[PDB]
Paper text:
One potential new drug target is 6-oxopurine phosphoribosyltransferase (PRTase), an enzyme central to the purine salvage pathway and whose activity is critical for the production of the nucleotides (GMP and IMP) required for DNA/RNA synthesis within this protozoan parasite. Here, we show that two of the three [name] isoforms of the 6-oxopurine PRTases are identified as HGPRTs as a reflection of their substrate preference for hypoxanthine and guanine and the third isoform is identified as HGXPRT reflecting that it uses all three naturally occurring bases. In both enzymes, the active site is situated at the interface of two domains referred to as the hood and core and is primarily comprised of three pockets identified as the purine base binding pocket, the 5′-phosphate binding pocket and the pyrophosphate (PPi) binding pocket.
To explain the mode of binding of the ANPs, crystal structures of HGPRT-I in complex with compounds 1, 2, 6 and 7, and HGXPRT in complex with compounds 2 and 7 were determined. However, the structure of HGXPRT has not previously been determined. The structures were determined at resolutions that range from 1.76–1.99 Å for HGPRT-I and 2.26–2.64 Å for HGXPRT. In all six complexes, a phosphonate moiety is located in the 5´-phosphate pocket. In HGPRT-I and HGXPRT, this pocket is formed by D117 to T121 and D151 to T155, respectively. Additional hydrogen bonds to the phosphoryl oxygen atoms also form with the side-chains of T118 and T121 in HGPRT-I and their counterpart residues, T152 and T155, in HGXPRT. For compounds 2 and 7, we have determined structures of complexes with both HGPRT-I and HGXPRT, thus allowing a direct comparison of the binding modes of these two ANPs. When compound 7 binds, the phosphonate attached to the linker binds into the 5´-phosphate pocket in both complexes. In HGXPRT the peptide bond between L86-K87 is in the cis conformation, with the side chain of the L53 rotated out of the active site.
Numbering used by the authors:
A (entry chain A): 9 to 114, 130 to 234
B (entry chain E): 8 to 114, 132 to 234
Amino acid sequence: PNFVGRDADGNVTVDGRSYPMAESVVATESTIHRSMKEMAQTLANAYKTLKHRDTHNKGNSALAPITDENPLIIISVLKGSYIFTADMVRYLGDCGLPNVVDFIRILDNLRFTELTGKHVLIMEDIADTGRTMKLLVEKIRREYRPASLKVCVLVDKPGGRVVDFKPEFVCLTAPTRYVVGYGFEVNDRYRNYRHVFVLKPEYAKRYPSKL
Amino acid sequence: KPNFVGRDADGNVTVDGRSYPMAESVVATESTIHRSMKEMAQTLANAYKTLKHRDTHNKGNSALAPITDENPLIIISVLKGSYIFTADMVRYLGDCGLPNVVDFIRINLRFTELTGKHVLIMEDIADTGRTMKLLVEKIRREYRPASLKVCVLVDKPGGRVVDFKPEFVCLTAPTRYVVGYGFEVNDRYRNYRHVFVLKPEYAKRYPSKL
Ligand SMILES: Nc1nc2c(ncn2C[C@@H](COCCP(=O)(O)O)OCCP(=O)(O)O)c(=O)[nH]1
Ligand SMILES: Nc1nc2c(ncn2C[C@@H](COCCP(=O)(O)O)OCCP(=O)(O)O)c(=O)[nH]1
Ligand SMILES: [Mg+2]
């Protein structure tokens, strides 16, 4: 239960802390985690009874269920999705969905090599124009041809989509503005904030120097 | 708040009613781990609050600059196991008001302006110490930072056979193989909210390749 207000200077405050960069709040921490917990229940319901090719015992030719021996493959997209993935896989643990996480950069390579015929779920933190995920779903499809490939996003910005891509799973929806907080950044700043805000346009270019 | 630890009808470890058949014992529950990290967030905040390092945000200011949103503390997390530890930790550092940024290394960085900066490595385990001794020596050589300290989630000082000691330690464990909360056996059990001693029978349970 977070309390959103304004300080004496007119800056947005969440639970008494001032966020001078924020214009408004998109979702407080309680809203974000309430969404991810229901999302984990949704994913678990969508994947628990499924079957895919057994990479555990290479000698078995029948298709195996999703267990700790043949878990769900989760591809987290660096950089901003690591906080989202961290909370998410623990929620999937609560719903008892066995899973494994490998990371990719948008480019640093995957290290998993047994994706063919496997159920695969990519976890990105935002879809805006839809380009980044359209290229990623096409690349993974042709390099590995999994059994299923689906996208779960923390934040969908539908109003700014240019290509035609939809995430199968969406935690939050956001307005067509630049957001920061909880993985979203401005030159890596505000990534560790526990809520998602709309950034003041005056702050969009405040840290131009390269890290 | 505190997690309840017991045993089920078959002697398996239970935490809050959920059974963990691969576990031998519980090193630390989620609440113990989070109380520790929250106290480390205070400790790190007191250590870096008043420091100063090179001003890269305004390269025309030859004077040193405090740790701000313009020149934050550089934090290097190592992948993969330490990403969950890092995710919780940076948020705790947010509550303690310590401005920081995180880039990841695996054993490739993308940050390059580390010289004259305060840098802190986030790792989940220090046992023999070889992996961390190699990293600090290589970063001091290729970056010449102002300071370079190490914060680890679990320290196993009975296992060290090489000269290295982390300046910041959340938990101290015996010389045993742990799984849970970042720690794994062939990428399993990473997402469990607690840290368990692994049964030696489960050590070679998933030999196949991912
Ligand atoms: N911080 C922030 N970044 C945004 C946003 N929208 C797009 N981006 C850029 C981008 C966010 O990823 C860059 C941040 P990174 O994870 O640290 O590399 O989203 C891709 C949009 P696409 O699906 O049209 O390809 C936003 O609202 N806030
Ligand atoms: N799961 C698990 N792995 C352990 C453990 N100890 C060392 N390792 C291996 C290792 C960490 O494993 C790396 C695997 P990743 O983090 O998933 O990429 O730690 C080396 C410590 P040292 O070089 O200072 O001696 C342990 O207790 N549990
Ligand atoms: Mg490790």
